[PDB]
Write a protein that binds this ligand. Structure first.
Ligand SMILES: [Fe+3]
Length: 186
């Protein structure tokens, strides 16, 4: 029985219920994430930017079965082309816009990775990816506006692969945290 989250806090409580069991109802999770109306005051604590690249800010450690974080993207900041380590990944915009470009898993052949599609994710929208869908790149293409997104990963994971668009070659990356629970984590 899914209800609208009134606040980020409420959203988090609801996520603990949704992940109370062993399996994930993706459509239900995506629905509740979307239903949350971004309130900049509720997440300002987590919205820590860096001048040079996007930051990953842990919000909730979950119940062992998921994590929740906020990512902050300066003008022109973007990600690698990357996977998500056999986890569910949900992305909701809290501020600004992000361009998401989808790529297919590369063949063993060295080949230019060609964009399967792109979309503009706008404030409050919740997107979903998993490895069965493909790979993606996420970018703030704005010249004038920062972006902020809310991400849920289940199970949690701290490693992923980056892919070279020219070749499809992958490299294993360890993902870091800029902050945890509002506290900067050098
Ligand atoms: Fe991603």
């Amino acid at each position: 029985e899914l209800l609208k989250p009134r606040t980020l806090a409420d959203l988090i409580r609801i996520l603990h219920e949704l992940f109370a069991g062993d399996e994930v109802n993706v459509e239900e999770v995506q629905a509740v994430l979307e239903a949350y109306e971004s309130n900049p005051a509720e997440w300002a604590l987590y919205a820590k930017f860096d001048q040079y690249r996007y930051t990953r800010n842990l919000v909730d450690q979950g119940n062992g079965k998921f994590n929740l974080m906020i990512l902050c993207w300066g003008e022109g900041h973007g990600s690698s082309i990357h996977d998500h380590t056999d986890s569910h990944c949900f992305l909701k915009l809290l501020q600004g816009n992000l361009k998401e470009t989808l790529f297919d898993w590369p063949d063993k052949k060295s080949n230019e990775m060609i964009k399967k599609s792109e979309r503009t994710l706008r404030e409050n929208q919740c997107a979903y990816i998993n490895d069965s869908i493909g790979l993606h790149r996420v970018e703030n293409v704005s010249h004038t506006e920062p972006a902020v997104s809310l991400h849920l990963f289940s199970p949690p994971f701290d490693t992923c692969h980056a892919f070279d668009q020219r070749t499809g070659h992958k490299n294993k990356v360890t993902m870091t945290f800029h902050s945890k629970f509002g506290i900067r984590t050098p």
